[PDB]
Amino acid sequence: ILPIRFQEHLQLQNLGINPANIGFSTLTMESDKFICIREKVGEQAQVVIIDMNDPSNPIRRPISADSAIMNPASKVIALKAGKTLQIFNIEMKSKMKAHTMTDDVTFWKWISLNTVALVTDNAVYHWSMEGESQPVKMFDRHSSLAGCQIINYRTDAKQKWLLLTGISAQQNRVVGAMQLYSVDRKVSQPIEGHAASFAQFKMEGNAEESTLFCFAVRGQAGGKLHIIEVGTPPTGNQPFPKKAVDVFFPPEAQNDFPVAMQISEKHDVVFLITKYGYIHLYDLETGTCIYMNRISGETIFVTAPHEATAGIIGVNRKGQVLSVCVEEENIIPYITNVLQNPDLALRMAVRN
Amino acid sequence: TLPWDLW
Numbered sequence: 207i208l209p210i211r212f213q214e215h216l217q218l219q220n221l222g223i224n225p226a227n228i229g230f231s232t233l234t235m236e237s238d239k240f241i242c243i244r245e246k247v248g249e250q251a252q253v254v255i256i257d258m259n260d261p262s263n264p265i266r267r268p269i270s271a272d273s274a275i276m277n278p279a280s281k282v283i284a285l286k287a288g289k290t291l292q293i294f295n296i297e298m299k300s301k302m303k304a305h306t307m308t309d310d311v312t313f314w315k316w317i318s319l320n321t322v323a324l325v326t327d328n329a330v331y332h333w334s335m336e337g338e339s340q341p342v343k344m345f346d347r348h349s350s351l352a353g354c355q356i357i358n359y360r361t362d363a364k365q366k367w368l369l370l371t372g373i374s375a376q377q378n379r380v381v382g383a384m385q386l387y388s389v390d391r392k393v394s395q396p397i398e399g400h401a402a403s404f405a406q407f408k409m410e411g412n413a414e415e416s417t418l419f420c421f422a423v424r425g426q427a428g429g430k431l432h433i434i435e436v437g438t439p440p441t442g443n444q445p446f447p448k449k450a451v452d453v454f455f456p457p458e459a460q461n462d463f464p465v466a467m468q469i470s471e472k473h474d475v476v477f478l479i480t481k482y483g484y485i486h487l488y489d490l491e492t493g494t495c496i497y498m499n500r501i502s503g504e505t506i507f508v509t510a511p512h513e514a515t516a517g518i519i520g521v522n523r524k525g526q527v528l529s530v531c532v533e534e535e536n537i538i539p540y541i542t543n544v545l546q547n548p549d550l551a552l553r554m555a556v557r558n
Numbered sequence: 559t560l561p562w563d564l565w
Contacts, residue, residue, distance in 0.1 A: 229561065229564070231563075355561070357562060375565050505563050507563035
């Protein structure tokens, strides 16, 4: 009995995709509904769309764009072709919206059903799908991210806390640099970190949910995971007590570091994935590490929440599509019996 | 130049 269930859902090569095209620069998974691969045959570019409900029937079509990201739910796709961005309805075969930027967009992502986040060299913008609005600048980038490869952009549930992540390879290390912006205080904070996520968490006795910020880093102090409340507790709330635990990197994982995080709000657990393909499971309330193992021989370069199970799904460099979820019937028993932590297990039970 | 997933 293990606290989690692992599973290979797909091998992309068996869906007809060339290994050259299975990578961060050409393959996106903005939700667990779709995977999008930008392929190039001769001098014709194509997008292959894989509906995760009907994997065996790919929508492979010729297109002129350097970058493609599927809406989290709708059959709507955004395409970047130079400095020109377009939002396209696939089933209507029609253009909804277009915009031409001044600066190149080096990174972009859907943060909701309606909004595309646009990252330039200098700034972050949010572009609304509905209406006529042009991209709106939210904040200017901080010097500490200059020259970084941008790997992620995250928001809390209310869109009041915004987080940009960049990394940089140096001789003896990968530097992690984050910028956390408060939409209400109108101020940013530079932070050293490699992977992060927000979560809603209900403390017992409180009037409202707390908004939590969780981030992992492999820095000067070794592997660390921090869980802190962001913002002012509402009337009726006590504050969440800051946690600070370890991320263990074995000796044989010398160059390893964190790359992805998703958080289960059904179970209040943190899923953490590293560059080498290890997963770690932590309790959100206490910061206790429940579990750790190696799930992939190759880098998992993109993840999303597995929404039906409150788990994590990802894609690796070999084209394996993998997921990890909580085993709902075994996690309490495993904490009680294998971990020998009846206090944590009661607390999880009790909070259920 | 080298994308991060290949580091």
